[PDB]
Amino acid sequence: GSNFCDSKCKLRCSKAGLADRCLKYCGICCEECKCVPSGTYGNKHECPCYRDKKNSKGKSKCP
């Protein structure tokens, strides 16, 4: 992962109960979307790409 995504996802996932999963999917979403919403939850309207990304089953993918 890029330095940008590693750094942003570290903060995004700093209060996540399932941290490794959070960091994994935040990283995947950040590489695709070039953004990570602020804070540790919510704020997803800051980046529509991140907000709207779905997994194969059509579920929200990005923490």
From TrEMBL:
It comes from the Eukaryota. Keywords: Signal. The keyword Signal applies. Belongs to the GASA family. This is Snakin-1. The chain holds residues 26 to 88 of 88 of the full protein.
